[PDB]
Amino acid sequence: IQIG
């Protein structure tokens, strides 16, 4: 999970 990568958010940004």
Resolution (A): 1.4
> Which tokens belong to 1?
């999970």
> Which tokens belong to 3?
């958010």
Measure CA of the first residue to CA of the last residue in the chain; give whole Å: 10
User: Which residue matches tokens 């940004």?
Assistant: 4
